[PDB]
Amino acid sequence: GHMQTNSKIYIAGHKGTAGTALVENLQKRGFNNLVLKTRQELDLVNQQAVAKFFKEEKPEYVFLTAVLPCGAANVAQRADFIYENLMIQNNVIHNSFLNNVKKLVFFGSGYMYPENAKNPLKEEYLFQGDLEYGAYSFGAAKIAGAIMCESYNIQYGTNFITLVLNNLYGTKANFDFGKSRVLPALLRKFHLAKLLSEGNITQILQDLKMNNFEEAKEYLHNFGISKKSVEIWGTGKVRREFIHSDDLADVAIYTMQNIDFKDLIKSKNTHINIGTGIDYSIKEVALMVKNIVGFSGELVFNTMDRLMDCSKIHSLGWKHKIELKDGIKMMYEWYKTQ
Amino acid sequence: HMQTNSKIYIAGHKGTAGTALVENLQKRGFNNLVLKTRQELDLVNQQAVAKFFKEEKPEYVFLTAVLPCGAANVAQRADFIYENLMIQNNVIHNSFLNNVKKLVFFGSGYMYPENAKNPLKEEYLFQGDLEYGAYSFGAAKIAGAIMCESYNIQYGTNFITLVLNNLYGTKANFDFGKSRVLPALLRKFHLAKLLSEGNITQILQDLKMNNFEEAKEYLHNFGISKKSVEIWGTGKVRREFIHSDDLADVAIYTMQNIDFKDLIKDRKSKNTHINIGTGIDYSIKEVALMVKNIVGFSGELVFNTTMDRLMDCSKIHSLGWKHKIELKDGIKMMYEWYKT
Numbered sequence A: 001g002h003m004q005t006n007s008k009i010y011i012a013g014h015k016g017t018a019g020t021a022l023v024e025n026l027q028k029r030g031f032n033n034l035v036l037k038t039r040q041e042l043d044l045v046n047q048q049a050v051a052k053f054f055k056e057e058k059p060e061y062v063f064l065t066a067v068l069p070c071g072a073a074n075v076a077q078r079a080d081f082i083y084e085n086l087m088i089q090n091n092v093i094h095n096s097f098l099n100n101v102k103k104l105v106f107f108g109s110g111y112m113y114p115e116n117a118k119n120p121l122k123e124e125y126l127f128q129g130d131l132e133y134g135a136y137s138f139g140a141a142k143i144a145g146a147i148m149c150e151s152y153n154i155q156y157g158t159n160f161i162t163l164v165l166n167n168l169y170g171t172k173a174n175f176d177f178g179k180s181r182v183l184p185a186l187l188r189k190f191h192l193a194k195l196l197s198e199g200n201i202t203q204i205l206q207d208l209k210m211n212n213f214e215e216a217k218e219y220l221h222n223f224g225i226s227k228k229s230v231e232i233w234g235t236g237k238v239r240r241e242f243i244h245s246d247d248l249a250d251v252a253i254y255t256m257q258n259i260d261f262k263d264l265i266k267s268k269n270t271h272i273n274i275g276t277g278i279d280y281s282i283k284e285v286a287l288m289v290k291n292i293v294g295f296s297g298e299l300v301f302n303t304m305d306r307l308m309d310c311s312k313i314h315s316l317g318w319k320h321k322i323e324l325k326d327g328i329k330m331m332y333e334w335y336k337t338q
Numbered sequence B: 001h002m003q004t005n006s007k008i009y010i011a012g013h014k015g016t017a018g019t020a021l022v023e024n025l026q027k028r029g030f031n032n033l034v035l036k037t038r039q040e041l042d043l044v045n046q047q048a049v050a051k052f053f054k055e056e057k058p059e060y061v062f063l064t065a066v067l068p069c070g071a072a073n074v075a076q077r078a079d080f081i082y083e084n085l086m087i088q089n090n091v092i093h094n095s096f097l098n099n100v101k102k103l104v105f106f107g108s109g110y111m112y113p114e115n116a117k118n119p120l121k122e123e124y125l126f127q128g129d130l131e132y133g134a135y136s137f138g139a140a141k142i143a144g145a146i147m148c149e150s151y152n153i154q155y156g157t158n159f160i161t162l163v164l165n166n167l168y169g170t171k172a173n174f175d176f177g178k179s180r181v182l183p184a185l186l187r188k189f190h191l192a193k194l195l196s197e198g199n200i201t202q203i204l205q206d207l208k209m210n211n212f213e214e215a216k217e218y219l220h221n222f223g224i225s226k227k228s229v230e231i232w233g234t235g236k237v238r239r240e241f242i243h244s245d246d247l248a249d250v251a252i253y254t255m256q257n258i259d260f261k262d263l264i265k266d267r268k269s270k271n272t273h274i275n276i277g278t279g280i281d282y283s284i285k286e287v288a289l290m291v292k293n294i295v296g297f298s299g300e301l302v303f304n305t306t307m308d309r310l311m312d313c314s315k316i317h318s319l320g321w322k323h324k325i326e327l328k329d330g331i332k333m334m335y336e337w338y339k340t
């Protein structure tokens, strides 16, 4: 149980999804001594500013959540994904070493694993084939971050642990059209399809912030939403897994308190996959959302699988608490209040 | 491309490749060079590197600076990845920010899978795990290559990675236990010869030592004696070598002739690094006999009973460069300088 009530804990990237979940869960657990810096206060690409922060604040524990994330919308930023993430990683990990940080947790992505690797993905599949093209430079940076943690642990006897996940979600999602991730996008589609099937024209106009029902029906049809059906743009066979941000926070804190480099060690692949151990076809996710929202209509289909093997984290005494059905239900309850 | 009055930065100019580039550029009239020692410019320090690029505005960059991975320093596993990532990231990003026209970076064969087929094609990147000792160094070299290519794709830069296995050259680093295989082999046979000719004085001056009993036990433990040079292994281990004049030639040829657009012409926009080399490897027996004959050592070669590595240089040949220095000729050039 390494971290104590008054241990100084730095959560890097604290305004992000994982960072917000860590701050909330640490405060609930009674951790009273968090240090938090916005991007405007501390640019983690700038070595001079990061070295100064560590020398002047001397945090004891570090959760490194800050990232330039690689997504469909920003995939053109191929150089930024490698440069900015290597700089964040290098500046935080090295200055943590220089200032005698006790322990650090870093987060990897399943983009670090080969595109053609077998599911479920084992930690030892690192370097067993080429990465997916769009996320190639991002995944290469995450590999370097994992190797940076292990290499410091070996040379300098640091305690820097890498946890690797595929897809993070939480209750308070972004539900904006063409800007929303898979679960929130499906939730909103099914909610609006339900409102259409119930003739709640008034609630449709409120939801879309529109003033003309003919215009609203056109807009909904363009997004495959109708009284009788929701269109899934795909075959429905793409598989997806999910981890709730409260489960990410739980396993990150569990790792900080219990899982040391000692416990993991020609030693290599000392990163640890995290997840729920189960995935879902987009068809299965859609039917689950449909059922939770209570839409009486049909799916219609219109046309890289990633599942972590969680054997290692299970063996080290953590498992997830939040099943996807309960996460989607919490997300929908939140949706209705906003 | 580069003009003789173009401002050219050679990073790491005191190293083997950097010294060869400085000399070969001067010999061709490229005299507008900017050169910084480690004391003048610590390339790990982002602030200092950003200031250098903003002050000096080099037009062309040869990035040769490295923390090298060898048998002796293999414990420095964190340093290999941190220091080299910082050098790479600081020079490549600040080159982009300051409108450098073209950059050449050097990779290592340690960026290829340990068990990849010889000869190694560029496309064997990420086709299996790296050799354990050089794992973190090879990962840093991969990130260097991907950093160049990713800048070329996103920003339209012209940053080219050339990858080699073993460098030697006229003005080489002859320090013992640096895993500088060919320079050290040349030195091992030279000292064996000095012992054979009974030249205590030159042994002590070469080793910069004082006591001959201690010079001897130093030498005997590197397998150096008056009667023999003893090498650990079977004699069958194969290695490829490139002379630093050939490295300088292909680096300058790349600047003058090879642009990113040439590397994605009827090729995928991936694995755009280029292997360089002579395309030929040798057993340690064959190299040791070459060295023995050039040094004129009259004693024995003895083998006392690591994986073969050879580049496929088809792509650089297709782009219009091939090596000029055959190994025997290059070792002769290196020995002549060594004796000077």
Ligand SMILES: NC(=O)c1ccc[n+]([C@@H]2O[C@H](COP(=O)([O-])OP(=O)(O)OC[C@H]3O[C@@H](n4cnc5c(N)ncnc54)[C@H](OP(=O)(O)O)[C@@H]3O)[C@@H](O)[C@H]2O)c1
Pocket (backbone or CB within 6 Å): A012, A013, A014, A015, A016, A017, A018, A019, A038, A039, A040, A042, A043, A044, A045, A064, A065, A066, A067, A068, A069, A088, A107, A108, A109, A110, A165, A166, A167, A168, A169
């Ligand atoms: N979300 C996922 O599905 C997913 C999947 C796999 C892996 N992961 C990994 O999990 C970790 C957490 O991801 P996340 O989704 O929580 O990230 P996120 O929501 O995108 O948050 C990233 C945070 O980092 C901050 N940041 C980025 N660059 C910075 C810089 N130069 N200086 C200071 N702060 C900077 C951002 O600040 P601003 O708010 O000011 O921009 C933001 O608050 C990352 O390592 C990520 O790669 C996430």
Ligand SMILES: NC(=O)c1ccc[n+]([C@@H]2O[C@H](COP(=O)([O-])OP(=O)(O)OC[C@H]3O[C@@H](n4cnc5c(N)ncnc54)[C@H](OP(=O)(O)O)[C@@H]3O)[C@@H](O)[C@H]2O)c1
Pocket (backbone or CB within 6 Å): B011, B012, B013, B014, B015, B016, B017, B018, B037, B038, B039, B041, B042, B043, B044, B063, B064, B065, B066, B067, B068, B087, B105, B106, B107, B108, B109, B164, B165, B166, B167, B168, B173
């Ligand atoms: N040599 C080989 O067999 C071989 C094989 C494959 C690849 N390569 C690659 O080819 C390139 C050239 O290698 P090389 O053997 O010529 O190199 P080298 O002889 O080892 O020289 C490296 C130079 O970089 C300088 N340097 C290192 N860190 C620095 C820092 N923080 N700030 C400023 N200068 C710094 C060193 O300065 P100091 O002298 O002050 O320490 C040194 O002069 C490298 O990219 C290398 O990895 C070489």
Ligand SMILES: [Mg+2]
Pocket (backbone or CB within 6 Å): A258, A260
């Ligand atoms: Mg314990």
Ligand SMILES: [Mg+2]
Pocket (backbone or CB within 6 Å): B055
């Ligand atoms: Mg000026």
Ligand SMILES: [Mg+2]
Pocket (backbone or CB within 6 Å): B257, B259
């Ligand atoms: Mg041309």
